[PDB]
Amino acid sequence: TQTVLPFTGLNTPSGVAVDSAGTVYVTDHGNNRVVKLAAGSNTQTVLPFTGLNTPSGVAVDSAGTVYVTDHGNNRVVKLAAGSNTQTVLPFTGLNTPSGVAVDSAGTVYVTDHGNNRVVKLAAGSNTQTVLPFTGLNTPSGVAVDSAGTVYVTDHGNNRVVKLAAGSNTQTVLPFTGLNTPSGVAVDSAGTVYVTDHGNNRVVKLAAGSNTQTVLPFTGLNTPSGVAVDSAGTVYVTDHGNNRVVKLA
């Protein structure tokens, strides 16, 4: 049984993320803002980002710092926890950052939609590293697990790829029948979840498995972002329906 979250006033929402407290963050892309809801509350909070233009992905780190990708201004911005200071991360050469993820060490991973690459920047660094994915076509969703394995939605090629921590060669995950997929997420068991945008469904694949499961969402309409919390609850931005839904 899915539950609709009590967000209000969303338009064409994009990324979703969930922090360790169960607080859910949504990129309300059509309104150039990020909104959050705490577990159990009915009051949503608009975050103090300024100057966003066509945001898409959102991530939240351990300390509560929020990262958002911004298509108009072609940048990734950080909203500092507490101070609420907004800074632009010093990525270089982006053409339209799509997805963002942050790992336990504060390293920020971004999909570079126009340049068919994934780039990462450690905390406070002026060195960005291009990850050795190959043959991507308009990558969008990205996620990183506690091991450092990176998962990328290769949107143009209707597939999901991973680069395991330690490896130099990507693996194509054995998802089947995806169509223009968008968001991706990974839980602490290594189960991967993907928004199969073009077939209105969310699909999941347990670690080391070859058999995917279709999650029992209903009435999704062109879904976009996906996230999973520490209890296994899956959150999907139901983009075409201007809402966010969750499934325990």
The coordinates were experimentally obtained by X-ray
The CB density around residue 243, as the number of other CB atoms within 10 Å, is 20
For residues 40 and 139, give the distance between their C-alpha atoms in angstroms, rounded to a whole number. 34
Q: Are 98 and 85 in contact (CB under 8 A)?
A: no
Give the integer Cα–Cα distance in Å for 139 and 98. Answer: 8
Breaks (C-N over 2.5 A) in the chain follow: none
What resolution in angstroms, rounded to 1 decimal? 1.5
In the chain, the number of structural domains is: 1
Domain region containing 158: 1-248
- Dist. CA 67–CA 116, nearest whole Å: 21
Q: Which two tokens stand for residue 194?
A: 């993907």
Distance CA 119, CA 92 (A): 9
CATH number of the domain to which 244 belongs? 2.120.10.30
Task: Say how far apart CA 31 and CA 53 lie, in whole Å.
Answer: 9
Going across the sheet that includes 45-46, the strands are 16-18, 24-28, 33-37, 45-46
Report CA 174 to chain centroid distance, whole Å.
Answer: 20
Sheet holding 213-214, edge to edge: 184-186, 192-196, 201-205, 213-214
SS3 of the chain: CCEECCCCCCCCCCCEEECCCCCEEEEEHHHCEEEEECCCCCCCEECCCCCCCCEEEEEECCCCCEEEEECCCCEEEEECCCCCCEEECCCCCCCCEEEEEECCCCCEEEEECCCCEEEEECCCCCCEEECCCCCCCCCCCEEECCCCCEEEEEHHHCEEEEECCCCCCCEECCCCCCCCCCCEEECCCCCEEEEEHHHCEEEEECCCCCCCEECCCCCCCCCCCEEECCCCCEEEEEHHHCEEEEEC
Give the total residue count for the chain: 248
> Contact at 8 Å (CB) between 142 and 101?
yes
The 8 Å CB, 24+ separation contacts for 171-175 are 173/205, 174/205, 174/210, 174/212, 175/203, 175/205, 175/212
Measured between alpha carbons, how far is 51 from 72 in angstroms, rounded to an integer? 10
